[PDB]
């Protein structure tokens, strides 16, 4: 039942911008998300001091996916352990406690990709977090699907648009509610030529070109959040990427970079079946 939203696909209602994504299959400068628009959205919350840590996504009733750098990044003295964080699921408002809507879960264990490259370019920027207890699904809490080879091959194409969501900074201040922006996947050569950072096959970049007019990008605080696409074949939402890195936010000629979820699915599956 993954990728089918209770408030949209389940009742055959479409959100305001999913049509834009469909038409392409041939957070800075975003907008407020609709209620229940991203039911798999997860907020990584630091306990003390209480603050926004990162974004993340719900992939099952006990597993949450995020960016490895959200938990481990020596250059900025970041090395969080299970008890330093909490996961808040089903949220819309950034700062308020959404009583009777959001659910807060404690972390049982964190698993960071063994070959996550924090020293150089954040290659394989992915991590899994197992919750202590399963979270109850609801109209605002629902898992997103993970792509198989076919889905990745057909949707991960230059020009095809995905959707990024998060409570991160609005500019390179803070948003009142969850932000959303649809961005087109960019050709590999263009991504490469836009930066001096070495790009790997475990990454892809997205965003509009300077001559395209439209804008939008992820920013500080959005890390770990999902880059999703709605399959035109089975109408389910798939998480194709994880907000990973960028140079500035929404700069002309620059693009946000995302962890290529399918490329690392082997690892994801290995972790899940081995550890329950």
């Amino acid at each position: 039942d993954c990728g089918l939203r209770p408030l949209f696909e389940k009742k055959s209602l479409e959100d305001k911008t999913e049509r834009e994504l469909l038409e392409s299959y041939i957070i800075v400068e975003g907008s407020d998300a609709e209620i229940g628009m991203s039911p798999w959205q997860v907020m990584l919350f630091r306990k003390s001091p209480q603050e926004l840590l990162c974004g993340a996504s719900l992939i099952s009733d006990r597993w949450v996916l995020t960016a490895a750098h959200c938990l481990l990044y020596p250059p900025w003295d970041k090395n969080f352990t299970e008890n330093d964080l909490l996961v808040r699921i089903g949220k819309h408002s950034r700062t308020r406690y959404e009583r009777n809507i959001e659910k807060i879960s404690m972390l049982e264990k964190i698993y960071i990709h063994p070959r996550y490259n924090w020293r150089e370019n954040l290659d394989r920027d992915i991590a899994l977090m197992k919750l202590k207890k399963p979270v109850a699904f609801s109209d605002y809490i629902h898992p997103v699907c993970l792509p198989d080879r076919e889905t990745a091959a057909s949707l991960l194409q230059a020009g095809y648009k995905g959707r990024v969501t998060g409570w991160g900074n609005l500019k390179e201040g803070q948003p009142s509610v969850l932000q959303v922006v649809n961005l087109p996947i960019v050709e590999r050569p263009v991504c490469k030529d836009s930066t001096r950072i070495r790009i790997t096959d475990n990454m892809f970049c997205a965003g509009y070109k300077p001559d395209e007019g439209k804008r939008g990008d992820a920013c500080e605080g959005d890390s770990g959040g999902p880059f999703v696409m709605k399959s035109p074949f089975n109408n389910r939402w798939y998480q194709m990427g994880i907000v990973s890195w960028g140079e500035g936010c929404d700069r002309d000629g620059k693009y946000g970079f995302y962890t290529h979820v399918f490329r690392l699915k082997k690892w994801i599956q290995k972790v899940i079946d081995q550890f329950g």
Binding site: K47, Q50, L86, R88, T95, R96, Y97, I104, M106
Partner: peptide, 11 residues
Amino acid sequence: DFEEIPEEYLA
């Protein structure tokens, strides 16, 4: 400016 969350989750 984060609203305080119930104690059960912080314990």
